[PDB]
Amino acid sequence: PEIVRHIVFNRYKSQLSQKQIDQIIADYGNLQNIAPEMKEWKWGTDLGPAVEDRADGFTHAYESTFHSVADFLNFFYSPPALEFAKEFFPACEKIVVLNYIINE
Amino acid sequence: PEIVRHIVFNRYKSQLSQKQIDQIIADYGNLQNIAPEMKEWKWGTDLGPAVEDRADGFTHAYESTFHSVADFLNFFYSPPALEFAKEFFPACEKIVVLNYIINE
Numbered sequence: 291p292e293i294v295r296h297i298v299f300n301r302y303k304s305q306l307s308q309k310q311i312d313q314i315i316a317d318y319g320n321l322q323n324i325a326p327e328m329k330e331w332k333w334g335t336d337l338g339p340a341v342e343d344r345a346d347g348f349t350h351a352y353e354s355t356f357h358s359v360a361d362f363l364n365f366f367y368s369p370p371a372l373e374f375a376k377e378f379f380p381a382c383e384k385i386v387v388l389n390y391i392i393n394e
Numbered sequence: 395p396e397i398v399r400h401i402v403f404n405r406y407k408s409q410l411s412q413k414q415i416d417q418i419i420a421d422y423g424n425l426q427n428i429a430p431e432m433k434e435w436k437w438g439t440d441l442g443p444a445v446e447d448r449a450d451g452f453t454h455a456y457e458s459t460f461h462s463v464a465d466f467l468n469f470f471y472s473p474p475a476l477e478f479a480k481e482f483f484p485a486c487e488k489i490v491v492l493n494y495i496i497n498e
């Protein structure tokens with residue numbers, strides 16, 4: 291099994307209310323109840339320069355697991371994912387996304 | 395209780411042999427055999443633009459888990475970690491690191 295990790299770092303645009311940002315994050319997490327392929331969704335906020343100062347302006351991280359590349363692609367091209375991407379990406383001031391096959 | 399995820403994205407300097415890059419990554423993974431603190435270390439290489447095209451020149455991801463911020467900071471300033479930092483950070487063309495508590 292070639293398990294894929296999907297890790298997103300972002301920074302939200304400064305004009306968005308915290309209410310709007312909370313909603314976007316809730317919507318992201320709720321994709322797991324629509325897309326059976328998306329596993330182990332988690333997120334959090336960077337702890338800041340008291341812990342380490344290499345976040346380069348990124349504030350949030352999101353992690354997802356997929357059990358194959360084929361499962362990831364089916365998810366990524368599904369209508370719910372395409373719809374969510376049109377809300378999520380324009381809300382980002384900064385974004386970076388890596389997809390990788392897990393090595394132990 | 396507050397478990398911390400430590401996620402690193404990097405890109406290596408172009409002058410390094412792949413042999414040395416391989417060694418650097420092996421040295422990184424081996425920190426968990428010295429460090430009780432660093433757990434569940436995994437890594438991989440970005441899957442490229444046929445999968446998704448938002449990696450922004452980052453090629454590698456590394457993930458690990460710490461029991462607490464206290465444990466992370468004891469780890470990060472320990473002698474093995476400081477020795478590894480001397481080879482790792484100068485080998486990075488660029489790097490971004492987020493540390494966060496998990497939300498689900």
Ligand SMILES: N#C[C@H](O)c1ccccc1
Binds near residue numbers: 470475476478479491
């Ligand atoms: N940031 C980061 C890497 O995880 C790291 C770098 C140097 C020493 C220990 C760990």
